Amino acid sequence: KFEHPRHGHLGFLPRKRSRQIRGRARAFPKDDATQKPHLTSFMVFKAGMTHIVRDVDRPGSKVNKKEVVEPVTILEAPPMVIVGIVGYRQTPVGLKTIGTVWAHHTSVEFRRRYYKNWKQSAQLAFSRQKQFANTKEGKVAEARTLNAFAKKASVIRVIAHTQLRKLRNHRVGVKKAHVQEIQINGGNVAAKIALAKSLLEKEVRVDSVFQQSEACDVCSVTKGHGTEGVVKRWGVACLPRKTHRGLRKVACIGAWHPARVMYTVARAGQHGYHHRTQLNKKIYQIGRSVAVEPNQATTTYDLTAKTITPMGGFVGYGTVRNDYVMLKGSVSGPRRRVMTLRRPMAPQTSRHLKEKIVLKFIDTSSKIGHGRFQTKKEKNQWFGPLKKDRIRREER
Amino acid sequence: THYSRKPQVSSKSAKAKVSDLRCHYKNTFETANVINGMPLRKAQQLYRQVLAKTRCIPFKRYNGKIGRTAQAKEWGQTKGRWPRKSVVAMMSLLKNAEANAIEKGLDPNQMVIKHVQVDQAARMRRRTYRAHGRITPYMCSPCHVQLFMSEKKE
Amino acid sequence: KRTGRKPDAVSMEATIHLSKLLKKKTFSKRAPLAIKRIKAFVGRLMKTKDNRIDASLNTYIWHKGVKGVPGRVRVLIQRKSETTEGNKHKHFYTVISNVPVASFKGLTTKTV
RNA sequence: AAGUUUGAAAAGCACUUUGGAAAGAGAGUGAAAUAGAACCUGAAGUCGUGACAAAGACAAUGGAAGUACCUCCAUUUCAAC
RNA sequence: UAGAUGUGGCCUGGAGGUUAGGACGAAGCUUAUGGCGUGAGCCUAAGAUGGACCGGCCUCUAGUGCAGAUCUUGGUUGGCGUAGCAAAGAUCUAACGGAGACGUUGGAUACUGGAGCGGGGAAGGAUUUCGUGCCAACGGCACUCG
RNA sequence: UUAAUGAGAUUCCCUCUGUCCCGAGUUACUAUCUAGCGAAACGACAGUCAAGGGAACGGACUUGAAGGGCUAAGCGGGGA
RNA sequence: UACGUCCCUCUCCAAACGAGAGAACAUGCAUGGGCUGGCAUGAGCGGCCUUGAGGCCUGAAAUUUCAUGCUAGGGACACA
Ligand SMILES: [Mg+2]
Ligand SMILES: [Mg+2]
Ligand SMILES: [Mg+2]
Ligand SMILES: [Mg+2]
Ligand SMILES: [Mg+2]
Ligand SMILES: [Mg+2]
Ligand SMILES: [Mg+2]
Ligand SMILES: [Mg+2]
Ligand SMILES: [Mg+2]
Ligand SMILES: [Mg+2]
Ligand SMILES: [Mg+2]
Ligand SMILES: [Mg+2]
């Protein structure tokens, strides 16, 4: 008889706190040995959002026509320092690591990750591996396992961490290094270590991994809300105003049989702070740093000079100082939470996902307000030498 | 009659009691058992930090829906509290048994709390008042606390 | 007691921005919790927890009623003593008082 | 409801000192304080800590049958049946 | 099973007989104290239990055996340090007292708002008044206060 | 049959709105944590399921399937 | 007596409490300046509008960069 479509999605149970804030790709793309060895993932930090105006393509009705305002997300992406190389056997109980070569140097932020205090400690992390690397048996026991990553290995995963001393953001209160294994999806695993062995202990910047107009998948950890009730966690319904013992509940959570509450009925508990993936988030610009190009947000039709950082920074994040990546739309983070990009799974051959992009406008109007001004040198033009600077720029 | 266990050396030992310790048996239980092998100075150091609420009393056996806390991990648990009245009531019972260690000639800086023992007293009565005219009990449940000490030869 | 006993009877005249410490707190508890988060303010300011209030700081925080509290308070912190030593002592208290200032834009933390 | 029926005798714990005083630890009384006034005996129930098989939970208990180790419990041999 | 019956058969209180214990420790009580009776039960030991009564046997006698009656009474226990102590006025500070959150005084901000947390009475209560102590248990938190 | 009256019963219309579409944010007070205090109703034992049989809708039986332990906040399916 | 972890404090992408993410001379904290943004022309004064997009507020359950100020290091197991 009467019914409705079921509330919430059973394929995101249990609604549980993710085991770490670090967004972590559960699966990397299928290894097409017909490609070149490359890096298929990258960790960025969610700065915040803004929106942009685009010259549209893909002839439809709202397309092949005047521009469009589409909301975007700014993800600050400093270059990642590769430290290790990790290979896996394809054994009948699923992949298993067959060793891990490290670099000879290992940044002081990486070694913090193997601690939880690091300032009362004695900093012995990787002490007998720096020493033993300078040995000869070290070089033996290192090429003995690199000559293994070709015999036994199929999956080769460098270990990259983030540069945070290169991320002058303070509101990212952490000084450890976020450590992430990254798949290499080239071919001829012999030539797959060759990449890994090469870029080891070298910085990997995000445009080396990704290109501008193509889409990624964003492994991330949702913004947490603590214990949310049934109406907020599952979005079931509110009982009528007349209800006793209140109305933000599921009335019937079980028949007489089965005489147990089902895993399908809605209950209150952890909402948010879940690991999500957000397939097919399309990059619109992968612009470089202000230290190298202090004209981030001025493409061709905003011949003024400006940067991505809005007037007064991104709210609750700061200024973007590094190789930001501009996606399209939502990303399952709060500000300054590490996001992991990933090259996508989908066939991606479409006139709605493989089309190239030019951005005719970006908004740097302040997040903190309403903002009516781009590029604060426009605000000074609206006003005059008002009494704040008048009491300083006329008192000399 | 005295004293469930004898200190196995009577001159190298102090002894102290209370009989009507005026507060909950259940809060006083773990307040006491938490220091049951500790040196005397490491036991006052515990209680005097339970009162500043930097270490807790790990409620065993009478935890029963007390809240979880971070300060109880050292005790190998999740539950624990900071019972002020039961801790200040054994700050006093310990400093008594100090005074029994000087009285015999024993450095209290050598005293080990061997065999604390808390149990239940006569359970005073003062009715309270329920709905519909039902006069229910409101027992107070005092407690006895025993403990003796000893030394540890170098 | 490196920077604690090195000075004797300090006096720093420091601003305590209070709207930052009392935001969306219940109005009925706002003038009491104003007092209480100056204790644990000037405590962290001088590594001691025995903080008195010199009845002009108190009269000030309460002058706008229990609900109305000034946004900032400029405070003169006296740390006098009975001169103890060692450890776990009591002889470092504080004689926190108010300062009529009539303005707060420009004045940093001072001393004496 | 309620035998304070402590002890033969109040000899009812002087006194020292820890505690602000209670109470505690000592002494001391007496045949017993392990008879300290809420006192003859002091049970069950429940609880406490000390020990342990220190066992080991995947209802408890129990039945039969063994075994492990431990039991001043019985008996017997302890130059012999 | 309902029932019937037997038992040189078991057990409790007491009587008439007999035999006999007991301050060199009786009743009682405890039990990984064994043994011995199919069993009811009995006997022993050992108590860092108890302190003054009492066992066996033959008859007599009855207020004579308890797990279960929404049994009765007393006591304890779980749930459980749990529900809660959420209507009605927000205490804040100095220095003072104190064995110590408490009280007192000062100042501060308040609340009652003259149909009052006012001042007087009747009904009713009858020392609750007052002062000085006190702080054991009572004032559902605490108290140096009541 | 009736004017007036109605915490009467009833229907429509107007206004008005969170009654609702469809919910969302805020606030005290609680719940939550703590110090102090502290009950009770209830209580055979208990206490994971499916199927079977059964006083015919089992917590214990039968046969399978799960189940390490102890936990805090919830909820209201069951414990006929 | 080791490497370390934990508590206490602080921070807040986390949070009912645990747990989490952190820091532990760091831009850490606190002020101030600047930016950004709210409001809409401040007490006072000159001749009511003028000073004047003024004054005030702006990180605080916790907007953003610059100057100056102070800035526990103690515990608990690990550990025998
Ligand atoms: Mg109703
Ligand atoms: Mg009779
Ligand atoms: Mg009868
Ligand atoms: Mg009976
Ligand atoms: Mg019964
Ligand atoms: Mg019942
Ligand atoms: Mg559970
Ligand atoms: Mg529960
Ligand atoms: Mg916070
Ligand atoms: Mg952590
Ligand atoms: Mg400022
Ligand atoms: Mg801050």
PDB file of C-alpha atoms (C1' of nucleotides) in Angstrom, chain A residues 17 21 112-113 115-117 119 121-123 165 170-176 223-227 270 273 311-312 314-316 318 321 334-337 366 368-370 376 379 382-383 386-387, chain G residues 2-8 11-29 34-38 40 52-55 58-60 62-66 73-75:
ATOM      1  CA  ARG A  17      33.551   9.120  13.139  1.00  0.00           C
ATOM      2  CA  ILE A  21      40.857  13.582   9.817  1.00  0.00           C
ATOM      3  CA  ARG A 112      57.269  14.797  14.153  1.00  0.00           C
ATOM      4  CA  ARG A 113      54.585  12.498  12.732  1.00  0.00           C
ATOM      5  CA  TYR A 115      55.658  11.383  17.879  1.00  0.00           C
ATOM      6  CA  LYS A 116      53.025  13.013  19.977  1.00  0.00           C
ATOM      7  CA  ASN A 117      55.236  15.375  22.000  1.00  0.00           C
ATOM      8  CA  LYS A 119      59.794  18.498  22.398  1.00  0.00           C
ATOM      9  CA  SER A 121      61.390  13.603  23.373  1.00  0.00           C
ATOM     10  CA  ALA A 122      64.969  13.051  22.257  1.00  0.00           C
ATOM     11  CA  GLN A 123      64.096  13.074  18.522  1.00  0.00           C
ATOM     12  CA  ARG A 165      56.811  25.085   7.375  1.00  0.00           C
ATOM     13  CA  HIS A 170      49.000  29.399  11.476  1.00  0.00           C
ATOM     14  CA  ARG A 171      45.326  28.459  11.800  1.00  0.00           C
ATOM     15  CA  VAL A 172      46.433  24.997  10.711  1.00  0.00           C
ATOM     16  CA  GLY A 173      47.656  24.496  14.241  1.00  0.00           C
ATOM     17  CA  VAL A 174      49.567  21.309  13.473  1.00  0.00           C
ATOM     18  CA  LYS A 175      53.295  21.036  12.780  1.00  0.00           C
ATOM     19  CA  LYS A 176      53.456  17.284  12.184  1.00  0.00           C
ATOM     20  CA  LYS A 223      32.554  18.605   8.947  1.00  0.00           C
ATOM     21  CA  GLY A 224      31.554  17.077  12.265  1.00  0.00           C
ATOM     22  CA  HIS A 225      28.408  17.925  14.206  1.00  0.00           C
ATOM     23  CA  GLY A 226      28.754  15.705  17.248  1.00  0.00           C
ATOM     24  CA  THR A 227      25.672  13.787  18.266  1.00  0.00           C
ATOM     25  CA  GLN A 270      27.585  10.866  15.199  1.00  0.00           C
ATOM     26  CA  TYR A 273      33.122  13.939  10.472  1.00  0.00           C
ATOM     27  CA  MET A 311      39.726  41.089   1.248  1.00  0.00           C
ATOM     28  CA  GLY A 312      40.544  40.074   4.802  1.00  0.00           C
ATOM     29  CA  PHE A 314      39.448  33.522   3.882  1.00  0.00           C
ATOM     30  CA  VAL A 315      37.272  33.521   6.981  1.00  0.00           C
ATOM     31  CA  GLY A 316      38.867  31.323   9.608  1.00  0.00           C
ATOM     32  CA  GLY A 318      44.077  33.063   6.481  1.00  0.00           C
ATOM     33  CA  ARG A 321      50.394  31.637   0.033  1.00  0.00           C
ATOM     34  CA  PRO A 334      35.666  22.543   7.296  1.00  0.00           C
ATOM     35  CA  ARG A 335      38.367  25.148   6.727  1.00  0.00           C
ATOM     36  CA  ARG A 336      41.985  24.016   7.187  1.00  0.00           C
ATOM     37  CA  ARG A 337      41.173  20.326   6.992  1.00  0.00           C
ATOM     38  CA  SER A 366      35.516  39.760   1.296  1.00  0.00           C
ATOM     39  CA  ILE A 368      33.802  38.354   6.214  1.00  0.00           C
ATOM     40  CA  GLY A 369      31.226  40.904   5.049  1.00  0.00           C
ATOM     41  CA  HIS A 370      28.966  41.259   2.437  1.00  0.00           C
ATOM     42  CA  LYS A 376      40.976  46.534  -1.860  1.00  0.00           C
ATOM     43  CA  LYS A 379      37.830  50.319  -1.788  1.00  0.00           C
ATOM     44  CA  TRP A 382      35.319  54.591  -3.389  1.00  0.00           C
ATOM     45  CA  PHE A 383      36.226  56.382  -0.151  1.00  0.00           C
ATOM     46  CA  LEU A 386      38.938  59.413   5.911  1.00  0.00           C
ATOM     47  CA  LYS A 387      39.859  60.301   9.479  1.00  0.00           C
TER      48      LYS A 387
ATOM     49  C1'   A G   2      66.192   4.028  28.314  1.00  0.00           C
ATOM     50  C1'   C G   3      62.668   5.087  23.724  1.00  0.00           C
ATOM     51  C1'   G G   4      58.490   6.836  24.644  1.00  0.00           C
ATOM     52  C1'   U G   5      53.044   7.384  25.991  1.00  0.00           C
ATOM     53  C1'   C G   6      49.624   9.724  29.607  1.00  0.00           C
ATOM     54  C1'   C G   7      47.701  13.500  33.062  1.00  0.00           C
ATOM     55  C1'   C G   8      47.764  18.782  34.415  1.00  0.00           C
ATOM     56  C1'   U G  11      44.719  25.403  21.209  1.00  0.00           C
ATOM     57  C1'   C G  12      40.018  23.851  18.329  1.00  0.00           C
ATOM     58  C1'   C G  13      39.187  21.249  11.684  1.00  0.00           C
ATOM     59  C1'   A G  14      36.904  17.574  17.158  1.00  0.00           C
ATOM     60  C1'   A G  15      33.389  16.944  21.438  1.00  0.00           C
ATOM     61  C1'   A G  16      27.376  15.059  25.776  1.00  0.00           C
ATOM     62  C1'   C G  17      31.576  12.858  28.787  1.00  0.00           C
ATOM     63  C1'   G G  18      35.681   9.846  26.784  1.00  0.00           C
ATOM     64  C1'   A G  19      37.909  10.048  22.338  1.00  0.00           C
ATOM     65  C1'   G G  20      39.864  13.261  18.437  1.00  0.00           C
ATOM     66  C1'   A G  21      43.256  17.241  15.813  1.00  0.00           C
ATOM     67  C1'   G G  22      47.112  19.984  17.961  1.00  0.00           C
ATOM     68  C1'   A G  23      51.154  23.062  20.488  1.00  0.00           C
ATOM     69  C1'   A G  24      54.268  22.393  23.930  1.00  0.00           C
ATOM     70  C1'   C G  25      59.912  29.598  23.528  1.00  0.00           C
ATOM     71  C1'   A G  26      55.720  28.521  19.142  1.00  0.00           C
ATOM     72  C1'   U G  27      53.913  33.946  16.949  1.00  0.00           C
ATOM     73  C1'   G G  28      52.005  30.378  21.947  1.00  0.00           C
ATOM     74  C1'   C G  29      49.124  33.620  24.665  1.00  0.00           C
ATOM     75  C1'   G G  34      46.513  47.717  10.327  1.00  0.00           C
ATOM     76  C1'   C G  35      43.104  45.175   7.105  1.00  0.00           C
ATOM     77  C1'   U G  36      38.206  43.298   6.454  1.00  0.00           C
ATOM     78  C1'   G G  37      33.517  44.061   7.819  1.00  0.00           C
ATOM     79  C1'   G G  38      28.899  45.872  10.824  1.00  0.00           C
ATOM     80  C1'   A G  40      24.970  55.211  10.204  1.00  0.00           C
ATOM     81  C1'   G G  52      32.774  63.647  10.412  1.00  0.00           C
ATOM     82  C1'   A G  53      31.239  57.261   6.197  1.00  0.00           C
ATOM     83  C1'   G G  54      31.985  59.989  12.539  1.00  0.00           C
ATOM     84  C1'   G G  55      32.068  57.178  17.242  1.00  0.00           C
ATOM     85  C1'   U G  58      35.198  43.474  14.784  1.00  0.00           C
ATOM     86  C1'   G G  59      36.937  36.756  17.258  1.00  0.00           C
ATOM     87  C1'   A G  60      34.853  35.763  21.517  1.00  0.00           C
ATOM     88  C1'   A G  62      37.247  30.763  18.848  1.00  0.00           C
ATOM     89  C1'   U G  63      37.748  37.020  10.609  1.00  0.00           C
ATOM     90  C1'   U G  64      42.636  38.008   8.503  1.00  0.00           C
ATOM     91  C1'   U G  65      48.180  40.081   8.496  1.00  0.00           C
ATOM     92  C1'   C G  66      51.629  43.402  11.635  1.00  0.00           C
ATOM     93  C1'   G G  73      57.856  21.678  33.856  1.00  0.00           C
ATOM     94  C1'   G G  74      55.674  19.347  37.251  1.00  0.00           C
ATOM     95  C1'   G G  75      53.563  14.635  37.841  1.00  0.00           C
TER      96        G G  75
END
